[PDB]
Amino acid sequence: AIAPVITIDGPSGAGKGTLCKAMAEALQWHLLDSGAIYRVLALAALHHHVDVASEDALVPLASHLDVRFVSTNGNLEVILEGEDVSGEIRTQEVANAASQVAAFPRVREALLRRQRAFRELPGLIADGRDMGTVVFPDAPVKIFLDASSEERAHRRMLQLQEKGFSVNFERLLAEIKERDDRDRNRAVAPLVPAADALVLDSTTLSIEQVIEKALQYARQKLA
């Protein structure tokens, strides 16, 4: 009776965002960008002067985190307390704060019900780190999108250059190196692929190939 869910987990810069949107549109399903939740929580903490390195301080904020997401009128907008912060949550200051807040056990549990509420018919495409291992363990379809850290740093560099930002590959390689250690080195819902997850390594695959392989797999298990 419950709605089917396709989980897409993987490290930062693996291309989950792009894949999820493409699958959601292809199947006309709902989307959940769990990372945006942790980022909106982080931005909230910064604006409310809540200690980002304090589990006690963060828990209250997470439990009442006022965040809504708007459908695809073209893309997706993240709202915090009535204000669009879609761009601000994508800043390095918020990305860093987000990994900080997502590290605490009680803070993550305080966000479980909120993420799980996204499971609604006809289906949900869930993007994150632990969608297939903690949030939605029973997902009929689980995908682990991964790629070498070097490639993910290279793609990042290029995207920042497109936007007109001056970058340095060495810095980006360390940046993703540090994020990977966090998401993967924490006794609390670490980044690990589910045993039944399709491991999609996109290092030498194009956006088109990834989407094609993902949909082939998902459609296979759901019809």
Ligand X SMILES: Nc1ccn([C@H]2CC[C@@H](COP(=O)(O)O)O2)c(=O)n1
Site for ligand X in 85-124 (CB under 6 A): 98-99, 102
- Shortest Cβ distance from residue 63 to ligand X (Å)? 17
Instruction: Note whether 34 binds ligand X by CB under 6 A.
Output: yes
**Rounded Cα–Cα distance for residues 38 and 89 (Å):** 9
- Annotated binding residue at 189? no
- Annotated binding residue at 132? no
- Annotated binding residue at 16? yes
- Annotated binding residue at 15? yes
21, 119, 129, 156: which one binds ligand X (CB under 6 A):
129
Q: How many residues bind ligand X (CB under 6 A)?
A: 13
Q: Using an 8 Å Cβ cutoff, are 19 and 125 in contact? A: no
Select the span of 24-32, 33-41, 151-159, 209-217 touching ligand X (CB under 6 A): 33-41
Site for ligand X in 181-200 (CB under 6 A): 183
4, 15, 128, 132: which one binds ligand X (CB under 6 A):
128
- Annotated binding residue at 17? yes
- Annotated binding residue at 74? no
4, 7, 12, 29: which one binds ligand X (CB under 6 A):
12
Instruction: Note whether 7 binds ligand X by CB under 6 A.
Output: no
- Annotated binding residue at 14? yes
Instruction: Note whether 132 binds ligand X by CB under 6 A.
Output: no
Instruction: Note whether 175 binds ligand X by CB under 6 A.
Output: no
- Shortest Cβ distance from residue 91 to ligand X (Å)? 12
- What is the 3-state secondary structure of the chain? CCCCEEEEECCCCCCHHHHHHHHHHHHCCEEEEHHHHHHHHHHHHHHCCCCCCCHHHHHHHHHCCCEEEECCCCCCEEEECCEECCCHHHCHHHHHHHHHHCCCHHHHHHHHHHHHCCCCCCCEEEEECCHHHHHCCCCCEEEEEECCHHHHHHHHHHHHHHCCCCCCHHHHHHHHHHHHHHHHCCCCCCCCCCCCCEEEECCCCCHHHHHHHHHHHHHHHHC
Residues that bind ligand X (CB under 6 A): 12, 34-35, 38-39, 98-99, 102, 128-131, 183
Binding residues for ATP: 10-18
